Design a protein around this ligand. Sequence first.
Ligand SMILES: COc1ccc(S(=O)(=O)NCC(=O)NO)cc1
Ligand SMILES: [Ca+2]
Ligand SMILES: [Ca+2]
Ligand SMILES: [Ca+2]
Ligand SMILES: [Zn+2]
Ligand SMILES: [Zn+2]
Length: 158
Amino acid sequence: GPVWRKHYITYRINNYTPDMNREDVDYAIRKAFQVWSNVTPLKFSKINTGMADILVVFARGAHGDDHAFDGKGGILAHAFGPGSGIGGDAHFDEDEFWTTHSGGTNLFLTAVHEIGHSLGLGHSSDPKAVMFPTYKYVDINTFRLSADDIRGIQSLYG
Ligand SMILES: COc1ccc(S(=O)(=O)NCC(=O)NO)cc1
Ligand SMILES: [Ca+2]
Ligand SMILES: [Ca+2]
Ligand SMILES: [Ca+2]
Ligand SMILES: [Zn+2]
Ligand SMILES: [Zn+2]
């Protein structure tokens, strides 16, 4: 399906979870974009105003799309593939407790997966892939994409 047909992509953080320090939210999301820019020709820039390609949102329950959140647990986040408007946007369930670490739900690891969707990736059947639909914490300091993730993204870009 859809892919971004340009190399410079913008994102904007619509609002901030009260679960984390603001700078930690910024850094998690930045690091998650870097995972993908490492392996494609894409460049990502955070903008503070205006229409971004990728809007990052924290919201709970019904929040104006067809993908209502479900309280703590279950669905952690969802994202829309490349396109105009809501296309590219990544939404994180505020009913989760977002963290920089192994506690609650790790924002960085979740964001890597969601941004994969924002770039056009679907799910992987390989438990080793970040694009596998089940959340499982792994050490974020040594995190690496699986070969399956890299194959998937390189099928769309570069
Ligand atoms: C590692 O990243 C994620 C992100 C979300 C989920 S999930 O919310 O539990 N499943 C729905 C989903 O795949 N959303 O993109 C599971 C893992
Ligand atoms: Ca949930
Ligand atoms: Ca968008
Ligand atoms: Ca929360
Ligand atoms: Zn949503
Ligand atoms: Zn997913």
